[PDB]
């Protein structure tokens, strides 16, 4: 009933990292209020409007800094674009669209130094209101011009982040200079402290030390997390989708964002009192074909993406796929029927956010099929990060999706 529905909605969202939740805690409170008050149409109306906002949300990122700071490489790295390809970044602001997400654009802004504007006049010239946040980039030490731009951005109620690039080169130079006494943490601390302490003379700012050529190292993961934390809840979905599938943390940000979105879609469609039947499963899988291929694209599991990984393993994409779970997820194994496996899965998924006493809330079969595919795709993408080492020891290289096996 309504109280079971509200509690299982609450239980579902409690399982996610704060920076990953695609609805706000007020959104949750209002949906729970309406459900508990039997205002079901109002609750569905909130969910519909939340989903429309999530699906239409644009993401506009301004990247500013002087020349030689790695700005073009950073803009390309953000988008997953090779330095060679069409749309790669090599006066006036220049847009760089995301290659795979229409609503996402990274803007190359000329450094305020190379102009003669005040901070406030710089912001108005570059059209400050179009952006969700600003990245201020340097490969050295940030000039007072940048502390003043940040102060101007902040006084306008927007977010900025100082990003110090080329940290890998400075570490490499120090290790070669002082191989007996090299202390990576001391170098990083000395660089961060200098930037932080000098920027503060005009502001303590978040400073992130990064290598533009490896988004998995140094402070780049902490930067992605902070950017997620600071965005409005509804924009975290498009931001998560824009990330590279290059770390476990980023794959899981995508996995968690998509799982929340399909749960909200399930809510909008309506709770069910009984487990959905399986007589039509092949037909539901067929209706979901386009969606499953979209999910494969999000996680880098489409056939074209698998080409790169299969060659580096010196094997065919086909032999590679043998050891991934998503290709035969829905195919019978061990002479167990798919609908009997799905029935056990649904009882597991529903007792997690439901417990053993309250009435159990079920959703349409398509919800469980999408949820299962997302966990499988994400687990396959994670295994891809470490496929060489996994291949040597362990028939699938990936972990099974939660609750599917028994
Ligand atoms: N090791 C390392 N190389 C980098 C990094 N950032 C950029 N590069 C390299 O530096 C070269 C380009 O240098 P820059 O001209 O200073 O930066 P850019 O990417 O061209 O962008 P601009 O700021 O407009 O000059 C390319 O070879 C990049 O591969 C970094 O963080 N680490």
Residue numbers in the entry: -1 to 88, 96 to 208, 211 to 401, 404 to 415
Paper lines:
To assess the effect of phosphorylation of the Thr95 on Irgb6, the amino acid was substituted to aspartate as a phosphomimetic mutation (T95D mutation), following a previous paper. Consequently, Irgb6-WT hydrolyzed two-thirds of GTP to GDP, whereas Irgb6-T95D hydrolyzed only about 10% of GTP to GDP ([Fig fig2]). This indicates that the phospho-mimicking mutation of Thr95 (T95D) in the switch I region of Irgb6 significantly reduced the GTPase activity of Irgb6. The crystal structures of Irgb6-T95D were solved with GTP (Irgb6-T95D-GTP) and without nucleotide (nucleotide free: NF) (Irgb6-T95D-NF) at 1.68 and 2.05 Å resolution, respectively ([Fig fig3] and [Fig fig3] and [Table tbl1]). The former structure possessed GTP in the nucleotide binding pocket ([Fig fig4]). Irgb6-T95D-GTP adopted the same conformation as Irgb6-WT-GTP ([Fig fig3] and [Fig fig3]), with an overall root mean square deviation (RMSD) from Irgb6-WT-GTP of 0.259 Å ([Fig fig3]). As in the Irgb6-WT-GTP structure, Irgb6-T95D-GTP represents a collision complex with GTP in which the switch I and II regions are located away from the γ-phosphate of GTP ([Fig fig4]). Phosphates in GTP are buried in P-loop.
